[PDB]
Design a protein around this motif. Structure first.
Motif: not given
Ligand SMILES: *[C@@H]1O[C@H](CO)[C@@H](O)[C@H](O)[C@H]1NC(C)=O
Ligand SMILES: *[C@@H]1O[C@H](CO)[C@@H](O)[C@H](O)[C@H]1NC(C)=O
Lengths: 114, 38
Positions: A9-13, A90-94, A110-111
């Motif tokens: 996860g992290g930044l992505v366009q 955009t969330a916190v995937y688990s 995830v952003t």
């Protein structure tokens, strides 16, 4: 031992693709059932995708056609290929797992930028 | 679980467990019953 460890996860366009690598030391076969959950900040956690030991797969309405589940039986991990990412992903995937007892991982943010 | 309910399954020392809609099975301190005042 960390179990169900997540990475990818992290930044992505917007409109891109991404890969996350929830992997666990346990036997991927015996665990029999693995899921995915994301929790947008302030939004109650929600199930993403599911897959059982037999092979049946189900996705949410906001999931199918964009990113599907996968799991190779060579390295104990579950693969889910992000594609065509949009802002409301955009969330916190688990990733979540359950043998006779429950298991849970730390998840990952995830952003998506636009 | 912090909440108290009637004992479904007895385990001991004021603890009880039951199956409900995380872990499928939960454990809690037994409640003797509804409180009342006269
Ligand atoms: C268990 O299966 C995995 C692949 O799913 C393999 O890499 C590993 O060597 C196997 N272990 C044993 C003890 O058979
Ligand atoms: C609720 O449970 C947590 C852990 O089980 C405990 O730390 C906390 O004090 C509890 N609060 C109440 C009001 O029972």
């Amino acid at each position: 031992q960390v179990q169900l460890q997540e990475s990818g996860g992290g930044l992505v366009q917007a409109g891109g693709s991404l890969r996350l690598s929830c992997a666990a030391s346990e036997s991927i076969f015996r665990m029999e059932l693995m899921e995915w959950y994301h929790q947008a900040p302030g939004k109650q956690r929600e199930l993403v995708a599911t897959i059982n030991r037999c092979g049946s797969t189900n996705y949410s309405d906001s999931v199918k056609g964009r990113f599907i589940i996968s799991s190779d039986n060579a390295k104990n991990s579950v693969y889910l290929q992000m594609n065509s990412l949009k802002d409301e992903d955009t969330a916190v995937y688990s990733c979540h797992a359950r043998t006779w007892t429950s298991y849970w991982g730390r998840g990952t943010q995830v952003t998506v930028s636009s | 679980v912090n909440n108290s309910y009637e004992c479904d399954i007895p385990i001991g020392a004021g603890i009880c467990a039951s199956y409900q809609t995380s872990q499928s099975i939960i454990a809690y301190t037994m409640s003797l019953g509804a409180e009342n005042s006269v």
